[PDB]
Design a binder for this molecule. Structure first.
Ligand code: NAG
Lengths: 39, 50
């Protein structure tokens, strides 16, 4: 059971929020590419 | 809200249909400054402060 979230202490001025469908021996291989081009 | 504590709602990441508001008969003032109501439904903005 997931019952521990300790990643931030505050959230003051939000510009953008987006809730989506979930993206997700070692059995799974997950490749991701993150790019910042022209905003 | 009261005018001293006016509510501000940030509107982002959606489709804004302004013709529903403009063609409503329930509004007495619809005075737009800096933009015309006819091209509001065409233009696109980063954020809307209500
Ligand atoms: C950002 O947050 C601080 C404190 O939370 C506030 O004083 C400031 O006015 C905010 N700025 C904007 C642009 O929202």
């Amino acid at each position: 059971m997931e019952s521990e979230f300790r990643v931030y202490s505050s959230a003051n001025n939000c510009t953008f929020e987006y809730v989506s469908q979930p993206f997700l021996n070692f059995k799974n291989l997950r490749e991701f590419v993150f790019k910042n081009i022209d905003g | 809200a009261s005018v001293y504590a006016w509510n501000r709602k940030r509107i982002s990441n959606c489709v804004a249909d302004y013709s529903v508001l403009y063609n409503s008969a329930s509004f007495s003032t619809f005075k737009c400054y800096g933009v015309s109501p006819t091209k509001l439904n065409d233009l696109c903005f980063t954020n809307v402060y209500a």
